[PDB]
Design a protein around this ligand. Sequence first.
Ligand SMILES: CCCCCCCCCCCCCCCCCC(=O)OC[C@H](COP(=O)([O-])OCC[N+](C)(C)C)OC(=O)CCCCCCCCCCCCCCCCC
Ligand SMILES: C[C@@H]1CC[C@@]2(OC1)O[C@H]1C[C@H]3[C@@H]4CC=C5C[C@@H](OCCC(CO)CO)CC[C@]5(C)[C@H]4CC[C@]3(C)[C@H]1[C@@H]2C
Ligand SMILES: C[C@@H]1CC[C@@]2(OC1)O[C@H]1C[C@H]3[C@@H]4CC=C5C[C@@H](OCCC(CO)CO)CC[C@]5(C)[C@H]4CC[C@]3(C)[C@H]1[C@@H]2C
Ligand SMILES: COc1cc([C@H]2Oc3c(O)cc([C@H]4Oc5cc(O)cc(O)c5C(=O)[C@@H]4O)cc3[C@@H]2CO)ccc1O
Ligand SMILES: COc1cc([C@H]2Oc3c(O)cc([C@H]4Oc5cc(O)cc(O)c5C(=O)[C@@H]4O)cc3[C@@H]2CO)ccc1O
Lengths: 380, 380
Amino acid sequence: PPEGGFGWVVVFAATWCNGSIFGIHNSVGILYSMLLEEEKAWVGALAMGMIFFCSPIVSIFTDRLGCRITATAGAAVAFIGLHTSSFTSSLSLRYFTYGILFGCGCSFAFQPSLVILGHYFQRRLGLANGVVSAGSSIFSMSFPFLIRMLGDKIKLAQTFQVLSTFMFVLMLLSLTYRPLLPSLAQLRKYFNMRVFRQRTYRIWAFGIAAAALGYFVPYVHLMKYVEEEFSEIKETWVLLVCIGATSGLGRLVSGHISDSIPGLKKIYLQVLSFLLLGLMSMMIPLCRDFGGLIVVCLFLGLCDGFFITIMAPIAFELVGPMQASQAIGYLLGMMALPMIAGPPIAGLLRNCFGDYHVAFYFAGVPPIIGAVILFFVPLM
Amino acid sequence: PPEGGFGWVVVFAATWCNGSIFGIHNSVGILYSMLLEEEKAWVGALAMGMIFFCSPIVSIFTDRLGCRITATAGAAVAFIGLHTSSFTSSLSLRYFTYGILFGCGCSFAFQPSLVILGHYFQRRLGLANGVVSAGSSIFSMSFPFLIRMLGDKIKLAQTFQVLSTFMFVLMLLSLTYRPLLPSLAQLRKYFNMRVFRQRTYRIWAFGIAAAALGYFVPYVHLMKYVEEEFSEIKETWVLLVCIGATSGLGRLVSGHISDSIPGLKKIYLQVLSFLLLGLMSMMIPLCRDFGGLIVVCLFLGLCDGFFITIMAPIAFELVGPMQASQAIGYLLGMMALPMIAGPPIAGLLRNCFGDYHVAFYFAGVPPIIGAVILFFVPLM
Ligand SMILES: CCCCCCCCCCCCCCCCCC(=O)OC[C@H](COP(=O)([O-])OCC[N+](C)(C)C)OC(=O)CCCCCCCCCCCCCCCCC
Ligand SMILES: C[C@@H]1CC[C@@]2(OC1)O[C@H]1C[C@H]3[C@@H]4CC=C5C[C@@H](OCCC(CO)CO)CC[C@]5(C)[C@H]4CC[C@]3(C)[C@H]1[C@@H]2C
Ligand SMILES: C[C@@H]1CC[C@@]2(OC1)O[C@H]1C[C@H]3[C@@H]4CC=C5C[C@@H](OCCC(CO)CO)CC[C@]5(C)[C@H]4CC[C@]3(C)[C@H]1[C@@H]2C
Ligand SMILES: COc1cc([C@H]2Oc3c(O)cc([C@H]4Oc5cc(O)cc(O)c5C(=O)[C@@H]4O)cc3[C@@H]2CO)ccc1O
Ligand SMILES: COc1cc([C@H]2Oc3c(O)cc([C@H]4Oc5cc(O)cc(O)c5C(=O)[C@@H]4O)cc3[C@@H]2CO)ccc1O
């Protein structure tokens, strides 16, 4: 492949996808507040989980139709969802219009964004994925502040209109996904399940799906933990700045260095990104000083980066460019449920003991189990 | 060409363009009213005239870029114009955002919609143009009532958002323009002016440009004339129904029958539309009865249909499928000024004498002169 040229354009488009999806999701809570201030928590998770739960279908549509058509359709559906959100005034139409439309369109627009990078970059696929991931991370962490500032000025409908504008620009950028590689019986044709005929992929996906609960618990619950335990410190934005900076840096660096790792050995990066996190999840209760929290945030971002930034290229390397959309889609589908179920269970455990210690101690285990499971994949 | 199949799909898309552009323009006045009701004319004409005045540049793109790219870009610009209209709250930013953006995007999206029809239909080009024109007419005369109903319910920003999603669907449909036939020095390359090397095209375009003032005066000024002179009749919607029905019927019929006329003889149809209308324009200040007004409306619609519905295929026939975008664009550009200037001059004439008699008498002449000019084009 070119490993450059028009590929870089695609990278930009890919970035505009990720940061504009997750970022918008990061704003959901703010939007909820808006609603309350105009009328004086599960739909937000449903819409976000629809990105990964519906990915297996997007994989089929990507193998059959293509990256461009699927991405454009998903972007159009997301635009329509945000549009009808701007128009709807209800608590039942909001659920349908946001979740079923916007999240599904996000899934359809998000699945092909990695397969296209795989189309254009082979030797420098890791670096392109790292660029996309770092840009997406920065944009996602920056979006909610802009949404809050808009809320201070305009109402909810206008905000939904701006989000639909973001989705519109996304769909326009999605047309740069120019194909570069070739492309009851119908039920068995669409669900052949050929990637699950390889032990390496099976065990890799199983480990990644097993790690997700405890992988995602700390990131959601750190802010609440610091707010509860540490009430006498006012510089809480330092934590966010540290996490974001180190996470973007780690994403870029991991994407770069994953290219120099010959074969399946890059899987080892992921284990470390699960090992330390695991261990880190069991030392958050032990932090008595601000500096300890800062160090934990640095390590949290470092662990966050590698996982995603190589999970994409490792998915492309395990099975090949042909069976890459399917592998990515089913990895995402398997991760869909545990990631959503984790933080809820962490909160439930917190409510049953009055402290986050047990929640973090239990969330530190699944990542370690996943790391141990993944450690044995490169050995065969 | 196919003269069918996917071409019909294009026809639908083409329809969605025309009816959705002109219809939206027909709503401008209503929008203005809403603005006043929230704060208690030239901009509307400028935005509409940008469709035809800017067509020569759209012709240059359509021949170097293509119908699909130009149509999508124009639709995107129109969407952005309606968006920023929904957001802006001012009397100077409104002018820019509506006129310069929406009208120019409408020009860019509207010019290729005829060239693509010519691409797909050659032997049945007239019928496709007639279908597009009839659907466009019905949609245009149906839009303002729906806009009024929406205004009675929601505010101006939401109405602009609805128009924006109309433009969005238009842009989505404009991707079905798949090409079917091939595609200081740069200044002379873009402005070669080769269609003007043909005397037939020169005289045809000159006659069509000369007729426009008086061609378009009666349609705008008939409602005002009946409101002023006929104040004792309350069934004024019968006039609109007659005009719309007969105009759509005439568009379809003229488009269908122009295919049976071998060569340049179809130009004669246009001269009839210029002759009768002329005479009709001179007989409006002679109707003492409601039935006479109904007959005049029927004849007005009949004259309206043929002109447009054959102006497209005759433009394609005079110069060929290669120099068709250029011919259409420059015919539109030449028509741009007189069509805008006409009704204003008719109103100015009405003011200075206290009645519409002289205005209609003067507006009846330019169409007759254009008919006489065009009569001699098929003779050589
Ligand atoms: C309830 C839900 C309802 C859902 C409704 C359905 C939604 C989805 C429907 C559409 C999805 C279907 C697939 C879409 C089509 C994708 C494929 C396709 O058509 O081809 C793509 C086409 C080309 O694809 P192609 O495949 O034909 O390319 C040709 C390749 N060969 C020859 C091999 C076949 O892409 C384009 O070329 C279009 C380019 C348009 C450029 C647009 C530029 C816009 C610039 C805007 C600037 C605005 C800012 C300016 C502001 C100024 C302010 C001052
Ligand atoms: C490895 C990385 C860990 C971080 C991360 O995963 C990746 O986890 C996600 C959770 C997100 C936060 C959720 C809620 C809020 C509160 C909101 O509060 C308004 C202001 C406030 C004070 O003024 C009240 O007014 C501001 C935004 C913020 C902090 C989000 C930022 C982005 C975050 C950190 C996301 C990011 C992708
Ligand atoms: C055949 C030719 C094609 C072009 C053309 O005909 C000639 O197409 C016609 C459509 C007309 C509009 C239709 C409807 C309305 C609503 C009305 O609302 C008053 C109140 C009422 C509810 O609307 C209830 O009493 C105001 C006028 C307006 C905007 C017309 C303006 C003139 C227009 C644009 C005409 C235009 C010259
Ligand atoms: C609300 O309940 C939950 C919330 C979350 C949030 O926590 C994270 C997180 O830690 C990491 C991501 C990254 O995910 C990716 C996956 C990919 O495959 C590719 C990528 O480019 C990305 C990134 O860009 C994303 O930043 C996303 C999120 C969720 C909010 O964005 C997780 C689990 C939950 O249950
Ligand atoms: C406000 O000042 C003016 C207003 C008007 C309005 O009167 C007409 C009219 O009589 C006919 C059209 C048709 O024009 C076309 C031209 C084409 O090349 C192809 C087509 O498909 C169409 C049609 O669909 C249109 O219906 C448009 C309009 C204007 C409002 O729509 C004219 C001159 C003015 O100065």
